[PDB]
Amino acid sequence: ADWDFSAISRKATALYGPLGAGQQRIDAWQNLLATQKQVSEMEKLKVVNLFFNKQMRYVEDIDLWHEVDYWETPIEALWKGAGDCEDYAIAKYFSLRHLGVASDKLRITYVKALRQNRAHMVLTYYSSPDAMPLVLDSLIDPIKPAAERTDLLPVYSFNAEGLLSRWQDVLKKMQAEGFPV
Amino acid sequence: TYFITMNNARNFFIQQLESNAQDTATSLGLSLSQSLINHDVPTMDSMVKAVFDRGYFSSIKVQDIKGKVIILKKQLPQESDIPQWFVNLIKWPSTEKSSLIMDGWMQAGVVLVASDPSYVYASLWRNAVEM
Amino acid sequence: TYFITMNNARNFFIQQLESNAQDTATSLGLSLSQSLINHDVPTMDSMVKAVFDRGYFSSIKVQDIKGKVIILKKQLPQESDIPQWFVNLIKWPSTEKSSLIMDGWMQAGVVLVASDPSYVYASLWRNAVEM
Ligand SMILES: [Ca+2]
Ligand SMILES: [Ca+2]
């Protein structure tokens, strides 16, 4: 399931306009995916989590998209260089899947962020089904065992799937951007 | 070839949408009971988002015992592409199913779930046969 | 006086049932996630039964974190007055929709909700009109 970044850049330019500095960030993403396939799974988690936390500024959807809730594709996140809680999680999810992390190990997790006192979303990694998960977050850079994140309270978790709803709309946008399905 | 009347197709969707809206309202009402007791708006907000983002509902609403709205998730208005005269032939009063949120035997509020008929309208409109 | 073809009705009805199975899986999975309810088998059994009796599913299944089947509710086995030639025109496989059962951050299992295409078979057989 290889990704054609030249065609993706061409299609995204038509969908969103000239990508500007977003093209360089998409180039940096392509480099990450090209050079991190053979490292350990724990290293994949670190470099992907750190890459998007550094490449994206946290800005609310109402400011960036003029919509209360708007789920970015990874290309949209890198085009804008910005997003909010679920945008980080989605971008890290698809990157880790492309790098070979099994889908059974990755969950989209709705949480309560205690310090911000608001609904929040993170990506969780389960080394085995009964394991304590690691939290890939947009609020901080370290990846910690979930129970060590005393500032978070989990609400519900989802295994990402699909082929209209929020996640399906993301997949629809990625198909238009040129990603294989 | 075999057909079914438009009215019979309509009846199936009314049954299935009301059942689905009621089932989510009841099961979500159970899940919301402790965060509502605790007045934990972010957790209630997070639960409704989890169900709403994954489903196809028009709206989910959480009220307290006095009817004051605590959580409201709504679908942005949708464009269609389906004439109103046809919708008038098949439309049914707006579906909204409720379930009480309980603190033991004491009623603590209500959750209200409304289905989204836009799939029903589109399926019947695209494949309607006049005979 | 509008009709829809039986083949198109079959597609709509199956899609609506499969969507309902997903929504029920999500809401039931969330409710079983609360207060370690999924470890209280008598309470979880009562909860799954309530959802099954009100729904139209072929089966609801609960597995724990090790994959052991803990709850399995299935349609009581009733025989069909529907001829095979008619079923062959409309037959479709039953899909199983899932949602996770959680204890906070720890995974506790999965709830599996299966659609029932035989319900569509019976509805179309009752309302089939030949033209
Ligand atoms: Ca958002
Ligand atoms: Ca967003």
Numbering used by the authors:
A (entry chain E): 51 to 213, 230 to 247
B (entry chain B), C (entry chain A): 22 to 152
How do the authors describe this structure?
LapD is a c-di-GMP receptor that translates changes in the concentration of this cytosolic second messenger into cell-surface events via an inside-out signaling mechanism that ultimately controls cell adhesion. To address these shortcomings, we report here two structures, that of the output domain of a LapD ortholog from L. pneumophila, also known and referred to here as CdgS9, and that of LapG in complex with the same output domain.
The crystallized complex consists of two CdgS9 output domain molecules that adopt a similar parallel dimer conformation as in the apo-CdgS9Output structure. The resulting complex is asymmetric with regard to the output domain dimer, manifested by a 5 Å tilt and vertical offset of one PAS domain fold relative to the other. The central helices α1 are pushed closer together—a movement permitted by smaller residues at the interface (S48 and S52), a perpendicular-to-parallel stacking transition of one of the F33–F34 residue pairs, and the relocation of R75 from the dimer interface to a more surface-exposed position. The net result is a transition from a four-helix bundle with poor shape complementarity with LapG to a two-helix bundle and an overall shape that is able to accommodate LapG. First, we identified a rare di-calcium binding motif in the N-terminal lobe of P. fluorescens LapG, which is in contrast to the single calcium ion bound at the same site in the L. pneumophila LapG structure.
